[PDB]
Amino acid sequence: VQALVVDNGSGNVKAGVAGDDAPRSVFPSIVGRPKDAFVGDEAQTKRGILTLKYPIEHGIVTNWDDMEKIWHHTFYNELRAAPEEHPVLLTEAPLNPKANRERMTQIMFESFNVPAMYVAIQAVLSLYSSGRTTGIVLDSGDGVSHTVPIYEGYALPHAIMRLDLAGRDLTEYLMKILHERGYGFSTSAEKEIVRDIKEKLCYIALNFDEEMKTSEQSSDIEKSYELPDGNIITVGNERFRCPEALFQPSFLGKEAAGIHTTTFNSIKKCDVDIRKDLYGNIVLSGGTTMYEGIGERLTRDITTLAPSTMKIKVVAPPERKYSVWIGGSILSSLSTFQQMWITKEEYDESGPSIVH
Amino acid sequence: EHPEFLKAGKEPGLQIWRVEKFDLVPVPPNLYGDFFTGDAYVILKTVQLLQYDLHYWLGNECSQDESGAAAIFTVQLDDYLNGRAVQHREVQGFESSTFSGYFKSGLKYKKGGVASGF
Ligand SMILES: Nc1ncnc2c1ncn2[C@@H]1O[C@H](COP(=O)(O)OP(=O)(O)OP(=O)(O)O)[C@@H](O)[C@H]1O
Ligand SMILES: [Ca+2]
Numbered sequence: 001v002q003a004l005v006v007d008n009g010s011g012n013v014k015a016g017v018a019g020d021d022a023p024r025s026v027f028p029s030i031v032g033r034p035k036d037a038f039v040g041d042e043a044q045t046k047r048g049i050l051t052l053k054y055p056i057e058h059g060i061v062t063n064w065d066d067m068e069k070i071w072h073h074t075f076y077n078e079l080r081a082a083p084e085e086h087p088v089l090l091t092e093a094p095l096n097p098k099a100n101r102e103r104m105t106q107i108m109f110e111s112f113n114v115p116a117m118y119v120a121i122q123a124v125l126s127l128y129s130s131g132r133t134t135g136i137v138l139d140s141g142d143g144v145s146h147t148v149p150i151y152e153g154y155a156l157p158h159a160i161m162r163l164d165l166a167g168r169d170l171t172e173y174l175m176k177i178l179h180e181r182g183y184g185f186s187t188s189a190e191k192e193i194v195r196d197i198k199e200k201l202c203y204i205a206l207n208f209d210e211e212m213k214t215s216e217q218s219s220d221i222e223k224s225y226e227l228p229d230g231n232i233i234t235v236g237n238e239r240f241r242c243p244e245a246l247f248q249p250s251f252l253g254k255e256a257a258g259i260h261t262t263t264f265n266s267i268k269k270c271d272v273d274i275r276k277d278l279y280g281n282i283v284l285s286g287g288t289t290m291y292e293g294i295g296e297r298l299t300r301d302i303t304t305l306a307p308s309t310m311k312i313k314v315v316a317p318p319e320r321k322y323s324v325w326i327g328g329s330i331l332s333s334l335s336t337f338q339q340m341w342i343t344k345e346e347y348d349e350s351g352p353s354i355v356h
Numbered sequence: 357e358h359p360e361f362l363k364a365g366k367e368p369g370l371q372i373w374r375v376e377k378f379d380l381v382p383v384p385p386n387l388y389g390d391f392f393t394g395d396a397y398v399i400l401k402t403v404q405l406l407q408y409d410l411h412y413w414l415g416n417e418c419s420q421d422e423s424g425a426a427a428i429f430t431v432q433l434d435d436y437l438n439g440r441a442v443q444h445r446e447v448q449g450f451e452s453s454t455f456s457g458y459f460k461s462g463l464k465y466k467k468g469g470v471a472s473g474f
C-alpha cells in the first residue's frame with residue numbers, strides 16, 4: 001500500500017515513505033569490508049578494519065554487489081520495511097545506461113522480490129517538486145552535475161549535459177588550497193571534516209574578481225570553525241574560491257565548461273520556440289546548489305551569455321537539497337500512481353526490458 | 357486513467373479540479389473563479405473547433421505537495437489527451453489574460469484551503 005522512495009545518490013542515499021515531506025533516512029553511499037559488509041555510517045566508524053568503496057560513481061552504479069548491500073541496508077537496517085511487501089520508487093541519473101536500469105530492475109524483482117517498482121529521473125522529480133512541468137534543472141550532487149531541459153513533463157534527451165564536477169571535487173579542492181595556510185587534510189576522515197567546513201563557511205561571490213579585491217583589504221572575510229579535536233581553524237578567501245570552481249573548472253585542472261556555460265549550452269540545444277520557458281525556469285537541485293549567493297551569481301552569468309531579449313529566472317527552492325526525494329514522494333502518493341508501476345507479475349512474464 | 361480523467365475534455369466548457377491530499381477533486385461549480393490561496397488547482401478549458409488548454413494554478417500559500425501534484429496531474433491529463441493539450445503555469449496574481457478570461461467575474465481569491473497531504 002505505502003510505497004518506499006529511494007534516491008540513489010553518489011554521496012548519500014535518501015530513503016523514506018511516500019507522502020513524507022523529507023527522507024527519514026539519509027546515509028553515506030559507502031560499503032566497507034574487512035581488512036559480510038558494513039554500509040553508511042557504520043562503515044565510517046570502522047575505517048581502520050574496513051576497506052571503503054563507493055559503488056555509485058558520478059551517479060552511475062558501477063559495483064552491483066556493493067549496491068545490493070546498500071539497498072539491503074536501506075530496507076532492513078534503516079527503514080525496517082519488507083521490500084517484498086511494498087512498491088518501490090527508485091531514482092536514476094539522467095542518461096542512465098539502459099543496461100544499468102535493467103540490472104537494477106532485475107535485482108529489485110529477483111533479489112528483493114519487490115511486488116511493484118518504478119524508476120524516475122532525478123532531475124524530473126526535482127522539477128515536479130518545484131511545481132513546474134517545464135524548465136531546466138541544474139542538479140549538482142556529490143559525484144555529478146547535470147543540466148536537464150524538460151518540456152511539458154518530459155526531459156529532452158538530446159539537450160542533457162553531464163558535468164563530472166560536483167561537490168566531492170569542491171571538497172577536494174578545499175583540502176588542496178587549505179595547504180596555503182598550512183593545513184594538511186588528506187585522510188578519508190579528514191575529508192569529511194573538510195566537507196563540513198565547506199558546507200558551513202563557503203559561499204559564491206557575485207563577482208569573483210571584485211570579491212578577491214575586497215577580501216584582501218581587511219580580515220572580515222575570515223571565519224572560524226571548531227575542529228573535532230577542539231582546535232580552531234580559520235578560513236579566508238578560500239570560502240568563495242572553493243565553489244568558484246563550479247564556474248571556472250580550470251581551478252581544478254579541468255578544461256570543462258562551468259555550470260553557467262553548461263546551462264546555457266543545454267538551453268541552446270532546444271528549439272528556439274521553447275527556450276523562453278527554459279530561461280524563465282532554471283531550477284536548482286541538489287546539495288552543491290546550496291551555496292549562498294548561487295542564484296544571484298548564476299542569474300548574472302547566464303544573463304550575460306543569453307540573448308538580451310530572454311527573461312532569466314533562477315529558482316532556488318529552500319528544500320532543494322532533497323527535492324529529488326520530495327518529488328518521488330509526491331509522485332508515488334498520487335491516486336494515479338497505482339497504474340504507473342511495473343508489477344512483479346508483468347516483469348516475471350516480460351523481463352527486465354519492461355522497465356522501458 | 358482515473359475517474360476524473362474519464363470525464364475530462366469530453367465537451368466544450370471549463371473543468372476545474374483542486375488538489376486535495378494527493379488526489380484530483382472536482383471543484384463545486386458554484387465556486388468557479390474563487391480560488392483558495394492555500395491550494396493548487398488544475399483547469400482544463402475545452403473549445404469546439406476539440407482543442408485543449410491545461411492550466412495549473414498555484415496559490416501563494418499552497419504546500420509543496422499540492423503545487424507538485426498539480427504539475428504532475430497536468431502532465432498526466434495531457435498524456436491522457438494524447439499530448440494535444442497546451443500546458444500553462446498560473447501563479448496567483450500573475451495569471452495570463454487567457455486564464456482570467458475564463459471567468460466572467462474575474463479571478464478572486466479566498467484565505468485558507470485544504471490541508472497538506474504531508
Ligand atoms: N549547505 C551546503 N552547501 C554546500 N554544499 C553542500 C551543502 N549541503 C550539502 N552539500 C554538498 O552536496 C553534496 C551532497 O548533495 P546530494 O545529496 O545532492 O549529492 P548526491 O545527490 O548524493 O550526489 P549525485 O546526486 O551527484 O549522485 C555533498 O558534496 C555535500 O557536501
Ligand atoms: Ca492547501
Ligand SMILES: [Ca+2]
Pocket residue numbers: 152434439440441442443
Ligand atoms: Ca501537450
Ligand SMILES: [Mg+2]
Pocket residue numbers: 009010122141142286324
Ligand atoms: Mg542526487
